[PDB]
């Protein structure tokens, strides 16, 4: 119906458990509120995050940047996970709609916070944020994403190995962008870029980091590619230079003895893939 | 300015300007004038710094 910020201070909780139900710090030199740091005092009863995003929207500005640092502290399943995932997609779209470098920077800061503290579902969202950062013209926002990558290292290449199929999926999103793009020369530039992405990982320049492991991703990527990026990749491969059990596994998703030796999709999907 | 010979000529010009500046600096009594002179001097100092800190 009605210092109100102070009221939030009056019940800020802190310590192991909240005490949500039911003024001077002990350290010397503060005149206000005598010396009373202590404040007089786990009910089951995502919705809040949209309101918090609205607060950032309503001129949060530097305070919104402060909120983003707070959000990393705030970060420290099911519908609740789904609502967060929907919000992350909405935020990336909002940043593109805003077309504002500072808004992009706040998103990049959120991405860096996500990299330090990412749930596996959150990490997929963070990779989407990283793709948005590549979409973003900020560049500095890309650097903030790099800081998140350092948190993932807490070694970008090691984080990519941890990412496994999810790291491959981010490459697949990059491959899909390549398929939309296609020049063959541009694909060759993209292949150099792929070595550069490997350099950011620090796992060399593709090559041993890519190669056969890249080829297993390429099998699955090629079926999606329908030539296009796979055709561009072949042109890039021709610029770069001059047994696909995984492609059989991708199709599933001593005859083929290598496929038999590791038929993980046959060994786990069974069903139609075993029939294939 | 970019030419070394031009830079040497500029330094000599600066010394002549400084001699005029010193007469301005006592200013009879000009407490406001001295502060105004200092702000202009700082920009010139930044330019001298720009060719080299040295």
């Amino acid at each position: 119906k009605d210092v109100k910020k102070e009221f939030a201070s009056i019940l800020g909780q802190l310590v192991c458990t909240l005490h949500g139900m039911f003024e001077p710090f002990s350290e010397h030199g503060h005149v206000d509120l005598f010396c009373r740091n202590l404040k007089a005092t786990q009910l089951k009863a995502k919705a809040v995050l949209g309101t918090l995003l609205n607060l950032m929207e309503d001129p949060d500005k530097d305070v919104r940047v402060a909120f983003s640092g707070n959000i990393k502290h705030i970060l420290e399943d099911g519908f609740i996970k789904e609502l967060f995932v929907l919000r992350m997609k909405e935020a990336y779209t909002h940043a593109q709609i805003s077309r504002n470098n500072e808004l992009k920077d706040t998103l990049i800061l959120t991405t860096g916070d996500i990299g330090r503290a990412a749930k596996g579902d959150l990490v997929p969202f963070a990779l989407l944020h990283l793709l948005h950062c590549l979409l973003s013209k900020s560049a500095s926002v890309s650097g903030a994403a790099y800081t998140e990558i350092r948190a993932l290292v807490a070694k970008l290449q090691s984080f990519f190995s941890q990412y496994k199929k999810p790291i491959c999926q981010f490459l697949v999103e990059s491959l899909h962008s390549s398929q939309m793009t296609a020049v063959a020369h541009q694909r060759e530039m993209a292949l150099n870029t792929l070595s550069e992405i490997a350099n950011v990982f620090d796992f060399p320049d593709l090559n041993r980091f890519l190669t056969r492991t890249l080829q297993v991703l390429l099998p699955d990527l090629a079926a999606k590619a329908s030539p296009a990026a796979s055709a561009l990749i072949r042109t890039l491969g021709k610029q770069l230079n001059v047994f696909k059990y995984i492609f059989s596994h991708l199709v599933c998703s001593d005859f083929q003895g290598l496929h038999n030796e590791l038929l993980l999709r046959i060994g786990e999907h069974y069903q139609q893939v075993f029939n294939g | 300015s970019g030419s070394h010979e031009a830079k040497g000529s500029c330094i000599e010009f600066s010394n002549w300007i400084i001699t005029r500046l010193l007469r301005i600096a006592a200013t009879p009594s000009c407490h406001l004038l001295h502060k105004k002179i200092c702000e202009v001097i700082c920009s010139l100092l930044f330019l001298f710094k720009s060719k080299s800190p040295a």
Binding site: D62, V65, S140 | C42, F46, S50, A54
Partner: protein, 339 residues
């Protein structure tokens, strides 16, 4: 000056005298003095204390021209202290229980630095060779401290004569945390004049790699700023003088740069913390450093390969610089040029 100036030097003698003197060393220096010549040196030290009592040394060595800015006091009897220092050079001679003197010797060097403050002439006597100081040049952290005392001596030394002192050190390699403090050399750049050719190298860059390394465990922000100040001194030295190694020093600077401004942005605060204030000064220096890089060139192309990482730190830094008190317009103009 006279006696009142003399007391301050005497107090420095007292600090060695004070239990455990200065730095908690057991020796009182007079206690450290406690062979026959060494006993005579101890007698000389008491006489030097007597010289301190007279205050005759103060208001001495009056002309300030050439050496140590405003003139050092005569510190007469500094040489008698120096004879004790020569005795200190004699102690631990076999190495150059075991090396017991080293700790006393470092204390003697710290006393020597106070003595160097005490006499401009005494610094001249060491330059003549003194001879023990030359022996010290011929021969750990205390040694780094001794080099720092030599650096104070260099500030005392007159121009050109100081260049001769730089010539006196046997090797640049011999000159090559506490080592980091020794790096924070810089004094020679401060003693601008001759030795510019010595500053020019053959391939410095390794030191820049060490700055990139942040090897010292403390990794103090002030310590990093001191390394930055040493880099700034190197930048000043380059201007006095008139590459890929410069880019490598830039690469060490960039690793500091990404933290710089972005760390300030994370703080979102005026830099009340002394390290934070030092960072703000460093950010102004970095804008000045960018102007220096622009003056160098070519230089930009070497900068470009690592430039994209530097730029992401730089855009935040440029906003941070306009706000910062430490940041200055001439450094800012280089930042505007980057913009």
């Amino acid at each position: 000056w006279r006696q009142r100036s003399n007391t301050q030097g005497s107090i420095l003698i007292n600090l060695l005298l004070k239990q455990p003197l200065i730095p908690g060393s057991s020796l009182s220096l007079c206690h450290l003095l406690s062979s026959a010549l060494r006993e005579a040196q101890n007698l000389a030290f008491t006489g030097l204390n007597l010289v301190a009592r007279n205050e005759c040394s103060r208001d001495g060595d009056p002309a300030e021209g050439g050496r140590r800015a405003f003139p050092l006091c005569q510190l007469p009897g500094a040489v008698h202290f120096l004879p004790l220092v020569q005795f200190f050079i004699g102690l631990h001679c076999q190495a150059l229980s075991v090396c017991i003197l080293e700790g006393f010797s470092v204390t003697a060097l710290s006393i020597l630095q106070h003595l160097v403050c005490h006499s401009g002439a005494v610094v001249s006597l060491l330059l003549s060779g003194h001879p023990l100081l030359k022996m010290l040049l011929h021969l750990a952290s205390v040694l780094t401290q001794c080099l720092k005392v030599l650096v104070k001596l260099a500030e005392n030394t007159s121009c050109d004569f100081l260049p001769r002192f730089q010539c006196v050190f046997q090797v640049l390699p011999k000159c090559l945390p506490s080592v980091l403090l020794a790096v924070e050399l810089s004094l020679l750049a401060d003693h601008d004049q001759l030795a510019p050719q010595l500053c020019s190298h053959s391939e410095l860059l390794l030191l820049y790699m060490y700055i990139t390394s942040r090897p010292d465990r403390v990794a103090l922000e002030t310590q990093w700023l001191q390394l930055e100040q040493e880099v700034v001194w190197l930048l000043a030295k380059l201007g006095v003088q008139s590459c890929q190694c410069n880019v490598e020093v830039v690469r060490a600077l960039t690793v500091m740069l990404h933290r710089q401004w972005l760390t300030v942005r994370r703080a979102g605060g005026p830099p009340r913390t002394d390290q934070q204030r030092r960072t703000v000064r460093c950010l102004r220096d970095t804008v000045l450093l960018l102007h220096g890089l622009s003056q160098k060139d070519l230089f930009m192309m070497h900068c470009v390969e690592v430039l994209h990482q530097f730029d992401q730190v730089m855009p935040g830094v440029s906003m941070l610089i306009r706000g910062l008190p430490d940041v200055t317009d001439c450094e800012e103009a280089a930042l505007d040029d980057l913009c």
